[PDB]
């Protein structure tokens, strides 16, 4: 299929501005292979283990809030967000749990 489709092919609700995705909603893309974008990283020589959630668009704060609600066992202070690239960082390894939560919707 062509990269630019015909004007009659596109619906009104597929365009930007519509469907109010810009306010308090979020989305996470799966990798080019079809897997969740949650990864483990080892930092500061290998003694600092973290979990990174990426390929996010929308409200990362809202995503963090919902993930916190679904994974209450993780202390609230262990979560951080890098806004310049919109990634969520969790102290420690929680790849399996975060994948278990995300796969229910994404």
């Amino acid at each position: 299929a062509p990269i630019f489709p015909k004007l009659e092919d596109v619906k009104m609700h597929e365009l930007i501005g519509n469907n109010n995705f810009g306010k308090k909603t979020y989305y996470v893309e799966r990798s080019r292979t079809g897997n969740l974008p949650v990864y483990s990283a080892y930092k500061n020589g290998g003694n600092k283990i973290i979990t990174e959630i990426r390929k996010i668009e929308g409200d990362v704060i809202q995503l963090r809030n919902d993930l916190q609600e679904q994974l209450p066992f993780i202390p609230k202070k262990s979560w951080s967000v890098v806004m310049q690239s919109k990634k969520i960082i969790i102290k420690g390894n929680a790849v399996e749990a975060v994948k278990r939560v995300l796969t229910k919707k994404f």
């Binding site: 009104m12 365009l15 930007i16 501005g17 519509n18």
Partner: protein, 53 residues
């Protein structure tokens, strides 16, 4: 959009064409953006002075 721009004499950006979805939204945008500068030439936008007051 084509008639509105043609008979108004101003070009509405394509991003706003894609975003705004009702004629009253068009009216609000045009009133709030273009009309002030047109009425007051001093209150214009300068490309070299974006954050001007």
């Amino acid at each position: 959009t084509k008639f509105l721009q043609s008979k108004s004499g101003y070009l509405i950006p394509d991003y706003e064409l894609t975003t705004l979805s009702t004629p009253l939204q068009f009216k609000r945008y045009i009133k709030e953006k273009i009309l002030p500068s047109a009425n007051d030439p001093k209150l214009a936008y300068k490309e070299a002075e974006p954050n001007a007051i």
